[PDB]
Symmetry: C3
Subunit: 309 residues, 3 copies
Amino acid sequence: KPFPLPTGYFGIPLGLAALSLAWFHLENLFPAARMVSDVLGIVASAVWILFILMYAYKLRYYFEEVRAEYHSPVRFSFIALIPITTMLVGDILYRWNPLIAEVLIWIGTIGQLLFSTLRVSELWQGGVFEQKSTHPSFYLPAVAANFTSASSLALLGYHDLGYLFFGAGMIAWIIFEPVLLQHLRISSLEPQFRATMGIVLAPAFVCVSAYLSINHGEVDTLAKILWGYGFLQLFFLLRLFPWIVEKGLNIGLWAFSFGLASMANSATAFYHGNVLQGVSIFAFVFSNVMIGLLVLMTIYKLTKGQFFL
Amino acid sequence: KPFPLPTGYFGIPLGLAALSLAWFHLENLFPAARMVSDVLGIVASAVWILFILMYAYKLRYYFEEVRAEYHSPVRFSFIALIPITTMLVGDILYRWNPLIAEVLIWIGTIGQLLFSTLRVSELWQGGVFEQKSTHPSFYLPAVAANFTSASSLALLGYHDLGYLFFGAGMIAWIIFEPVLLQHLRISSLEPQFRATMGIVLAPAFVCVSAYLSINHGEVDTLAKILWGYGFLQLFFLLRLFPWIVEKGLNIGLWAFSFGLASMANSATAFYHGNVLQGVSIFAFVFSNVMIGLLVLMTIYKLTKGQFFL
Amino acid sequence: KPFPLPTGYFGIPLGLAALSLAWFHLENLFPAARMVSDVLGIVASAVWILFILMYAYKLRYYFEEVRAEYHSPVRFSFIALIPITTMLVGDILYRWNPLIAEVLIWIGTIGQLLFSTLRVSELWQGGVFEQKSTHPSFYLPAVAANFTSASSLALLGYHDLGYLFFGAGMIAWIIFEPVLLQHLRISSLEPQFRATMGIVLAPAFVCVSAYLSINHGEVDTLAKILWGYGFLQLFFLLRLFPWIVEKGLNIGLWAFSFGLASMANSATAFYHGNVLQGVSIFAFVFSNVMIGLLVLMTIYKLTKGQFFL
Ligand SMILES: CCCCCCCCO[C@@H]1O[C@H](CO)[C@@H](O)[C@H](O)[C@H]1O
Ligand SMILES: CCCCCCCCO[C@@H]1O[C@H](CO)[C@@H](O)[C@H](O)[C@H]1O
Ligand SMILES: CCCCCCCCO[C@@H]1O[C@H](CO)[C@@H](O)[C@H](O)[C@H]1O
Ligand SMILES: CCCCCCCCO[C@@H]1O[C@H](CO)[C@@H](O)[C@H](O)[C@H]1O
Ligand SMILES: CCCCCCCCO[C@@H]1O[C@H](CO)[C@@H](O)[C@H](O)[C@H]1O
Ligand SMILES: CCCCCCCCO[C@@H]1O[C@H](CO)[C@@H](O)[C@H](O)[C@H]1O
Ligand SMILES: CCCCCCCCO[C@@H]1O[C@H](CO)[C@@H](O)[C@H](O)[C@H]1O
Ligand SMILES: CCCCCCCCO[C@@H]1O[C@H](CO)[C@@H](O)[C@H](O)[C@H]1O
Ligand SMILES: CCCCCCCCO[C@@H]1O[C@H](CO)[C@@H](O)[C@H](O)[C@H]1O
Ligand SMILES: CCCCCCCCO[C@@H]1O[C@H](CO)[C@@H](O)[C@H](O)[C@H]1O
Ligand SMILES: CCCCCCCCO[C@@H]1O[C@H](CO)[C@@H](O)[C@H](O)[C@H]1O
Ligand SMILES: CCCCCCCCO[C@@H]1O[C@H](CO)[C@@H](O)[C@H](O)[C@H]1O
């Protein structure tokens, strides 16, 4: 029974892929991390292939649904999950086949940049985006995609180009967040969108993870500054969690996985650098437990026919 | 005749304590600064003890008044003055008794973080905070408290944890200020709140003072950048001063003391580092004259029964 | 036939002067750049003298028109073009006469700082500036003027004072842009103002150019971060260009020249530093072609009596 794949489902392979990469970065300290990384990376890649095929089906047979999501000043953002996940799968595959990895990384980089250049800029024409369009999902095309390009290009050796993407993401983040948080303060995000509060966890941690990927894992003043704001936001979101899930636990909670996985990834670098190793251990374990709970809730939802539309 | 202590009065020991610390940092250049520092520190500590006892009385006998201030999306911020001043008094007392200092510093740090995690985040639920709630006082829990933790923890030797608090404050500052200044441009702050424009002086100077405390007094590019924006804001506030006091000079002007004291503190580090020593001298003298005028106006108000509620 | 000079016309000598300085910075790599720099610098200086004389005439004989522009919460910003161009002409003239250069640089620096301190701060009184006043032109007094002071003072040897102005501009930029872009998203900028979207190109490139001028041309992490966001904005504005010129090509397009010239200037430093030399060459050529097109369209407009009011 055909259905149009909800684009947000790409957050699942995104979170798993990012978590694979976190474990990969533990390999030199703890060799057993290699197997955990490889298993997460294969599962993420397989889910990504499936969802890419489903989205190709959506494009072929439900094109007007894609067109409507693209032109929406809110829903367009989830499309950025496609190139973001494509790059992360490339990053995973690099351990086995750098040529294929490089192809995926460049496709995702050119894709995300074309996407933002076409759609993010178009918002500045005014009159379509409304105050109520000011949602955490906007971080995906505006911020997360650039950080992912930055870290992926660094992996391929393009450190200076990586810094360009890094800067685009970092400054875009601090330029958007002020108006997002003011909007949230004034207007209550409706329950149907609240799981996307998890995306608010992502910026600082995705930022510092990308930064450390480009700067050879040097845990410097900037990295520590970023981690601090990251943890502030974590604490805030923990306090907000009962409100986030007021209307029940749902699959949208995968929104938190990107920030959680990036907190795990950045923890490996802090630990390697002998900076706040206790905090690093807590962060790494915490993020893995939470993503583990997402996986278990997702298997549960699947073993009952409550997964796809 | 019992009364509920207005929470804002903690700005008095706050400003005096911060100024004690500024003079403390002049000791190695000018030994006579020691006595001035110690006198300011004892006076600040004594006033703090008195106000803590008064607030304990408020909690015991005027609890509903505290509850109302806590739940207000505007008035809650002044409560952050309590842990901020507790930490600064700890910092003062460190010169005489590090054990007692450490207790006060940790109580104020855990207290402020718990306070923001409970209340600052709760605003993001929407519908309580309004555009008109966008006031300079929000810098206290969001920004100043984190900088104070950063510098206090650095004093105790916890430089990396200090950088985490520093980053939380710095990024929180740049995330809030944009919407504050836009709000002020559009909506005239009512005279009763205008003295709190003095808090707008604080961020850059409290930021750079905390930064220099953590980075061993190294006056680097970041420090100079911060000072520049700090002085811009000083100039702006000087030009605005007749509007700020349109309806008369009042005790609320202690709002300026935190930024003034932090400008004095940071001046000592610039001077030590042989950076802009002339500017440093001007800044240090200017801040002391202005706080001196606050003290004289406050003694005046007291010698007439116009101090407490 | 007397007329009041539209203040925005100062953008012409501004763009040409900035471009002269870009070519000046190519001299050590390519000696022929000297002549191109000198020709652009003489033309910019001559146009600046003419426009200064015209504005002096405006002040003498059309003072109420100046007063109205000054008090406008939108139109005041263009006045900042006067001290900005004065400083850039000083920077040009430094190659021939440092004494005269120093006079112009200090006049423009004191002038711009006095101007912002009087007018930018006055906006914070509220009730005059409206949401609809949130225009790209605000970058001129708030941001561009400080960067120009920073680079001009560095030229004269005042590197630490230069960093103060730099910081004031950089932090002012990130404090304003968030609310500008949110405003543009919600409200369509009217065609008559759209050419000023070109000013949105300026911040990152003017910032990095000023930074590199102060830090001895060291292309570091900050510089690369700035360039990245700069290019993001360039791409966005390229995509937006047909909307910008919906109602036709007009002389207001000189708004883009400051950012274009600064992109050329910063390219020379990236090239010198052997960072992204290919990107540097593209940027330098692109900016010169676009400004060349502005010059040709302007000569065209002049050879038909469609230049002044
Ligand atoms: C994965 C992303 C796919 C998004 C595709 C939607 C593209 C825009 O779709 C349409 O194309 C036509 C022009 O070519 C025009 O009608 C419109 O501008 C637009 O509706
Ligand atoms: C997400 C990975 C690649 C994204 C490709 C997006 C294709 C969009 O397509 C474009 O959308 C524009 C709207 O802004 C339309 O006006 C264009 O004519 C259409 O070509
Ligand atoms: C939005 C927040 C941005 C903060 C930027 C932090 C500035 C980085 O700080 C710099 O880091 C270096 C590396 O450790 C130090 O040596 C420098 O002295 C320090 O200033
Ligand atoms: C990124 C965070 C994950 C790193 C997990 C490390 C867990 C190991 O634990 C640590 O092992 C050390 C030696 O190997 C011991 O010295 C430590 O005392 C112990 O805490
Ligand atoms: C110094 C700071 C003191 C602030 C105390 C006010 C705390 C909240 O007070 C109340 O407590 C009850 C739950 O425990 C609930 O009614 C409410 O959420 C709240 O009204
Ligand atoms: C300022 C120094 C310590 C602050 C302690 C604050 C105690 C707050 O108390 C809490 O406030 C919440 C509201 O956000 C209530 O809902 C909680 O149930 C109540 O426990
Ligand atoms: C919000 C504003 C943040 C600006 C961050 C400034 C970046 C710091 O700058 C860095 O400082 C070091 C120390 O002096 C230098 O060596 C670096 O080369 C310089 O880029
Ligand atoms: C933080 C700013 C306060 C520092 C105040 C310093 C006042 C001393 O003044 C300075 O003393 C020097 C030697 O000690 C002399 O060389 C200087 O010429 C003189 O200006
Ligand atoms: C190049 C910049 C010139 C701007 C000049 C306009 C200055 C303000 O002009 C007027 O001056 C009078 C006070 O002196 C008062 O009426 C007003 O505040 C103001 O209208
Ligand atoms: C742009 C180069 C120099 C600028 C000088 C500006 C002169 C402004 O002049 C002033 O404007 C104020 C308004 O904010 C008025 O209230 C003042 O009384 C008037 O002196
Ligand atoms: C608003 C965005 C501000 C970002 C500030 C970037 C921080 C600068 O970064 C610092 O630059 C130095 C010079 O290359 C490095 O050595 C430091 O290790 C690096 O952190
Ligand atoms: C700021 C950007 C402008 C610099 C333009 C440089 C153009 C020269 O071009 C370059 O010249 C080099 C040697 O001089 C050759 O090695 C290069 O291959 C060639 O690309």
